[PDB]
Amino acid sequence: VHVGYAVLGGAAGFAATALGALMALGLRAISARTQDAMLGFAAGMMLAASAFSLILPGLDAAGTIVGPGPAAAAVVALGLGLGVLLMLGLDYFTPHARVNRVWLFVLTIILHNLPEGMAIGVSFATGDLRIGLPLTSAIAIQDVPEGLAVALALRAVGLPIGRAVLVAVASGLMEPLGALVGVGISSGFALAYPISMGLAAGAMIFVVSHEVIPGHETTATVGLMAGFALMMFLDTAL
Amino acid sequence: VHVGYAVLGGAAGFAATALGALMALGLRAISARTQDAMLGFAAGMMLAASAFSLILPGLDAAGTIVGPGPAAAAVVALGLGLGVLLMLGLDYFTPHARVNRVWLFVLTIILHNLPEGMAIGVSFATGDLRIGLPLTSAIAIQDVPEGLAVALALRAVGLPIGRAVLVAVASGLMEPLGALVGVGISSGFALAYPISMGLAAGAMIFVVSHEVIPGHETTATVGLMAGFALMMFLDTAL
């Protein structure tokens, strides 16, 4: 079934996060510019994952379901706006004393991860490996530096590196959960698939626009360019 | 010693090649445009590996050895021209009836691989992990799609996929050999290091300029851009 490809896609999600987190054991600390570059790469990957692997495939799905006119782009775009609105609804409904500021930063990481799991599941809802696999693989690529980054950031707020890595790994647990959810919401009816692809792309564009906010400027855009270029390459080859 | 980091860098070389080759077992055949994209990515990685990880570090090495004037850039540039001339000397001295055209294509792959092993060894000749590790890791990244590509190409000239993959893996054996050689030629005297960095960068720019020759045009430049962008990202983060 679809859940299968979605469950293994989420699984690669969690593994990749865990690998980055485990790399944090060696390093313990990293320069500000290297962390900025890593994040910029991760945002570039996500920005184009939602463009090339979610919106355009979503529009083509919608186009076969309802025809070539604006109805399809309307479905995809309304799903996308719904995804923005949902991530904006969380973030308000969700707050994010050292013990409590660690919890708020963890909530940030979990709210971040929710859309990416969802996107993996949504991409594997038609069983289409030519939509799930490049998406999923981009998600996992950028999960590595982000697990690294997450664990280091938690060490930096005051945790011993071991707890920091343990919490990063647990964080990565949110990808398969979101994969189950994305495979849920995208199977109830025909339009559920392109609606869900819009919705996933929108949620990701929101977490990026809300976390691209973090000198340390020229370095993060080299990363963003790299991560965006690499995605285009993945879309073409896969 | 330096040979240690060089031997493990070469080792990652061979492993990566083998992983791409093993992936060819599943696929057996691939579209022309996906193979072109893969190669374009591999050329972009190499082009910037020789720029950002060989020439500029080579110039800085040369600059500390002989001073900031043109003497350093002269050493690096003369090494680079020597590397072009050496790869041009091979290719003439080296030819590259199905059984014999497979051997000529294998010779092509071995002549291709020689500079990359050398570059790994040259990058680890000062023991400087900030020069070897990003270089080495770029070499291994692009060894994966190139093992894939090599094995598929050999299947396509008429080999059974099993022999094709076996020969691709064996091919990847040339990276640690070249790592030993690059760690040799770069240790005999002080200038040997920046001379060798020029030489490695030049040999690679030659094999790229000689194999970038292969419609199927717009797709390979998406790959080249991606592979070049990714290298910049690696140079910055590592």
Residue numbers in the entry:
A (entry chain A), B (entry chain A): 54 to 149, 162 to 279, 285 to 308
Sentences from the paper on this structure:
The Zrt/Irt-like protein (ZIP) family of solute carrier 39A (SLC39A) membrane transporters is critical in maintaining appropriate cellular levels of zinc. ZIPs represent the only identified zinc importers in mammals, providing metal transfer from the extracellular space or from internal storage vesicles to the cytoplasm. The identified ZIP fold is unique and consists primarily of a transmembrane domain of eight pseudo-symmetrically arranged transmembrane segments (TMs) 1 to 8. Together, they form two separate helix bundles encompassing TM1, TM4, TM5, and TM6 and TM2, TM3, TM7, and TM8, respectively.
Overall, the metal-bound and metal-free structures are reminiscent, each displaying an inward-open configuration of TM1 to TM8. The metal-free and metal-bound conformations represent the structures determined here, while the outward-open state is a generated model. (B) Side view of the inward-open metal-bound structure. Bound Cd2+ ions are shown as purple spheres. The transport domain includes the central ion-binding region (M1 and M2 in metal-bound structure of BbZIP) for which the electrostatic potential is highly negative in the absence of zinc. In the inward-open metal-bound state, release of the ion from the metal-binding region is mediated through zinc-binding residues, including D144, H275, and E276. Release is facilitated by the TM2, TM3, and TM7 bowl, lined by the invariant D144 and H275, and E276, as also demonstrated by our metal-bound and metal-free structures. To investigate zinc-dependent movement of the transport domain, we aligned the metal-free and metal-bound structures using the static scaffold domains. The analysis reveals a considerable displacement of the transport domain, with the ion-free form being shifted around 3 Å toward the intracellular inside, combined with a substantial twist that tilts the domain 11°. Minimization of these distances through stepwise translation of the transport domain across the membrane suggests that an 8 Å rearrangement toward the extracellular side is necessary, relative to the metal-bound inward-facing state.
